[PDB]
Ligand binder design. Structure first.
Ligand code: HEC
Ligand code: HEC
Ligand code: HEC
Ligand SMILES: [Cu+2]
Ligand SMILES: [Cu+2]
Ligand SMILES: [Cu+2]
Ligand SMILES: [Cu+2]
Ligand SMILES: [Cu+2]
Ligand SMILES: [Cu+2]
Lengths: 455, 455, 455
């Protein structure tokens, strides 16, 4: 008498409601086992992985992660996979939580333009990763082919104010982080488990600024958190808060009151958060260079009244979140498109630089370029800058140390090199600086920086 | 009054029954503390890490992982380590679960041709890794020097139908994955934690195809799962099933109903599985490139009657498991030996290619080379191939995209590059294709591919 | 009615007692919520990361990890951060366990020579990592900016005989492991998560030999264990013992009786150990190349009476712990300083080599250089060595195999290459060998080895 033994399906078959991230379908709200028909379509498509950076994703339902599936333990699921005729590759599916070889893989093999089906009973309650299972499996997963299926316990999950859907992935581009253009998959980097981006929901900034998740003080938030991998294990953490509960897959064990929790590659967890004070709460992989150098940050923004007895501090700003504190970086997308078309203006560069200056430069030189006299020199009306604007390229790329004088004040400090900035980025930041705070104007081009880097 | 306080040893000393993977000794089936004499011998020996790839392993008892040791909490263990006189290195042992400095290491130091002993009381119930503890410790572990010791609780573990022994390891060869010949240990790759192979039980295919583990529908299977490392943490997972229970070392905590669980480097767990429906269940490290590009897959094959109410799908096939869906790849071993002896025939190559074509090429071009008209072009009687057979080398190594015509049908798709295939592999796959499905015949050599790669 | 609801602060404000690793402040020993004033100062400073290897650390309170903070759940904490005027960078703080955006980060932003404050209520009991939150966050963390804050439950933790403070970190130097001199931060290695050192408490040997932690047989030891990262997840393990209990952050779950446990990047745990038999117990990251090739080993030394019924073996020695079995390696620091000043004598080299020979060479050739006739050849009065002393450089760097004769005995074995040793190390070890056991004398210089490596 297997687990999930709740009887044959009753009533009429139900068409599963699938939702796109970061949203989840309604709770099933039923007390009997059903036949649930799931229809999921694979689409291969270019999308923006970062501003001005395109990638050819392979997707379940048009999104990364793929559509969220929600059924009840004991349901019989008739699973239809369609492969869009525009696809170049064959695809299939392995759903964790399926009891059967391959989790569906052999019977769901689907060539472009075709459809397949298989039927399984959902014996196991829990939150589960599903992903493509087509050789080379790692390429298909790295291209975005993963999502979550929730198999509810028979009584349903406890009611909460909000449910969200967040899934980490590691991505492997031929180009470096934030190198612009259409970036191919990089098999070498993937085999070595050296990702160029580590992301929530398939893109840089997918869940930051104006795309943050929302709740209010006093409300409960449940997040279904997946780790599609392919390779990385997430040190999954919420900055400035705690999880009331963390439950992995369909495990009997529930951990309560933790802030940092390890999600295996291919793993999934349900976490619960209670909003206590207003502000922005950051979901990160706390393997910190992923969070702050490769894109692995998401925001849950809580609105409501401050409570100074609990926290007197200010909201998250660019000192910590860097260039993602702002609503968006659309100016970088505009500038990159303008360079492609050969139509790049000084103002395109100024606006792109403005977005990129936040955190990256403002932490020391300030948002207004004033610096701090004798500690951090000014960029606003800087004589040192105006004397030799082109030297700024070497300063950004290779740093500056030693005694210098700026606006009649001596400095003897260290600006670290910032060699990871791409040529266009250095060009744009510097064009912004040159055209702000009554500086001389002019501009630096991507090709100017390339030549200096090449020295 | 220390834990495991069950009295002085009683009766006569017992000689421990040690077993080679994937098998385990009988349950001790006793109710009193004994003196248990363990005799374990270190042997350094070349073995096949993959087809036609040899490696000089250092082993406890002739195998990787080493012999399984099984005692009862409260036993006094008199541990004898012998180092075979053919050994070049000194060796010793640290058993997790030992209470004492080094877990035995200082007193078990054993030069080639010598023997050592130390005595310890097994105070701690649990499943524990043991490994060599001889500087450079990481080299000794990376060479295969690890195994499991089970310290039973006093009542014994619950009875199950089968017990098996599976242990993950990361391996570091100078050559790339599947590069043939005797491969040295690569210290650089090891320090960087960049393994070339990630394996269960010391070899590719050690537990796949005809070497799978077995059980029947309705039966319980306990697996003692170790992670010898040296470096990697396993996202340990069973495809298409769930673990009833996962228990780490001798921990009081037992997790129930999970599919994916993180095993630390040097860690060990006891997992329980109940067979529900027939087919092949894959144990993997779900850091996916390990599982599908570096060897980290093992099979538990369940025989019995299908249950279409639980799973209507087909058994695991080469679309998912690739070239390990088949019983074995002995043809690759034969072809590699033939190249060594200068006796390599066309048929040796054809049979080696046949083994390697499964998954790697058949996912798109099909097992019969028919492809799918207008979506994947045919390899069977392909005019495009016959027009310029040597171009096939560039197609496999560097991919093909753009408009082409094959057997009177237009294609406009993408075949990704497969540059990770070694020269012999490309040669053999192509010789198989050229000599199948009424294609022109002939052959490609490893040296032909080398020259094209070198372009 | 939030967690930690124990009332407004009562009594007078308390000035927090902060302690430097590996020590912890006294238990708060109180039954009422207080206002606790914390004053923590950031200092940037060069320290020795290894013998003769300097690094510019950025520190909370002058140490890595930073000062330990100890408060009670329900306390109101008024947190003052001062940035020393000698600092070149701005700094701030995110304390895990804070309920509020950034964990303090925006309001604690502090330029060199300035001070900031924010107030928070400690609602969440547990052990928590705190770290700098200043862009580039990963650089600041990698430079040493992390520590632990304990928020006690209201009843206090159970009494133990000793409390200690241990925190892992991964470090990224431009130079290789044990390459001497002032080593810059290496951003490339950090982004790739390829550390050169992995350390407890900010240095090689910080907690080994004469800097070990101590307890006696029968005593309980609690260790507050942090993982500052920035990037690595620790397979945290105690060699030759077991943890009675492991509790992560403020989690409700407590695991009992485990030896190996995974600590997320940014995570923290409280572990408990009961001393049973005397000797040295090694805390390691069991991703083994970290422990034995990158510095990740710490010692808890237990004094008291042997108990041969539990463990008959000898204390940890250089076969396992290598060059850290000894009290210290101060001779290496002396020799490195002498080379800097151009004052390096033969004896400076001999004493430095002596320290480095332990484990690295003695495992095979023995502490007395006698070797083992016919198995490992002698270094003591070695004719083979004396015939061509300079050949020894190639033997250490590239290994030796094949038939050789030494002191009238034939050998046919393998000495692996040791290419990871730095030029000064090879020079010093060889100068030690040449000047010991009635060998001919003379010396090898760092520049001699460089030239041979360069071949
Ligand atoms: C703190 C860590 C800094 C960050 C981040 C950035 N800069 Fe910087 N900068 C900093 C210091 C301490 C100095 C003086 C170095 C010395 O030798 O004492 C500088 C210097 C400059 C200059 C030249 C001086 C001037 O015109 O004020 C320029 C043009 C400059 N810095 C620009 C710049 C930009 C564009 C940055 C972001 C990309 C940036 N700096 C980051 C400290 C810090
Ligand atoms: C799908 C992902 C494929 C896999 C895996 C392999 N091949 Fe392929 N191949 C595929 C496509 C879509 C195409 C057409 C590309 C285009 O420009 O439209 C091809 C082409 C070939 C050819 C040439 C055409 C022909 O003779 O049919 C050859 C000889 C070929 N492919 C061989 C080949 C081999 C040996 C493979 C395994 C090693 C292999 N292909 C993998 C799709 C896919
Ligand atoms: C065991 C793993 C060894 C370690 C660690 C080191 N040495 Fe070694 N050494 C070893 C062997 C088996 C041999 C003989 C190799 C053969 O071809 O049979 C050697 C040889 C030498 C020699 C030359 C012979 C002699 O003078 O005895 C020298 C000078 C030597 N080894 C030095 C040396 C040093 C300095 C080491 C530490 C840095 C060292 N060896 C490590 C085995 C092993
Ligand atoms: Cu796919
Ligand atoms: Cu999976
Ligand atoms: Cu060994
Ligand atoms: Cu160990
Ligand atoms: Cu800082
Ligand atoms: Cu943090």
């Amino acid at each position: 008498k297997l687990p999930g033994d709740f009887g044959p399906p009753r009533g009429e078959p139900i068409h599963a409601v699938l939702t796109s991230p970061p949203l989840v379908p309604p709770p099933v709200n039923r007390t009997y086992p059903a036949k649930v028909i799931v229809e999921l379509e694979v689409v291969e498509k270019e999308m923006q992985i970062s501003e001005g950076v395109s990638y050819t994703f392979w997707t379940f339902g048009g999104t990364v992660p793929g559509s969220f599936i929600r059924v009840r333990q004991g349901d019989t699921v008739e699973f239809h996979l369609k492969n869009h005729p525009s696809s170049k590759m064959p695809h299939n599916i392995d759903l964790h939580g399926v009891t059967g070889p391959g989790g569906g893989a052999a019977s769901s093999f689907t060539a472009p333009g075709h459809e397949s089906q298989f039927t399984f009973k959902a014996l196991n309650e829990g939150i589960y990763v599903y992903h493509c299972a087509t050789a080379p499996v790692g390429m298909h997963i790295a291209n975005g082919m993963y999502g979550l299926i929730l198999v509810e316990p028979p009584e349903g999950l406890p009611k909460v104010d909000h449910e969200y859907y967040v899934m980490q992935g590691d991505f492997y581009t031929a180009g470096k982080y934030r190198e612009k253009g259409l970036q191919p998959f990089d098999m070498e980097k993937a085999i070595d488990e050296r990702p160029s981006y580590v992301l929530f929901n398939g893109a840089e900034g997918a869940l930051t600024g104006d795309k943050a998740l929302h709740a209010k003080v006093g409300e409960t938030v449940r997040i279904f958190v997946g780790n599609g991998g392919p390779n990385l294990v997430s040190s999954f953490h919420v900055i400035g808060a705690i999880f009331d509960q963390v439950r992995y897959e369909g495990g009997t064990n529930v951990q309560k009151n933790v802030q940092t929790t390890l999600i295996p590659a291919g793993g999934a967890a349900v976490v619960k958060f209670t909003a206590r004070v207003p502000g922005s709460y950051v979901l990160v992989d706390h393997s910190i260079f992923r969070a702050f150098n490769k894109g692995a940050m998401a925001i849950l923004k809580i609105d409501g009244a401050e409570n100074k007895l609990v926290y007197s501090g200010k909201e998250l700003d660019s000192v910590y979140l860097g260039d993602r504190a702002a609503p968006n970086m659309s100016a970088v997308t505009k500038a990159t498109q303008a360079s492609v078309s050969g139509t790049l203006t000084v103002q395109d560069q100024v606006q792109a630089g403005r977005a990129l200056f936040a955190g990256t430069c403002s932490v020391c030189h300030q948002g207004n370029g004033a610096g701090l006299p004798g500690v951090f020199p000014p960029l606003a009306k800087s004589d040192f800058l105006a004397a030799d604007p082109k030297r700024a390229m070497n300063i950004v790329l290779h740093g500056l140390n030693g005694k210098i004088k700026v606006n009649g004040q001596e400095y003897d400090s260290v600006m670290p090199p910032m060699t990871q900035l791409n040529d266009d980025e250095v060009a744009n930041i510097l064009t912004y600086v040159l055209n702000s705070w009554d500086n001389p104007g002019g501009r630096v081009s991507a090709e100017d920086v390339k030549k200096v880097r090449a020295q």
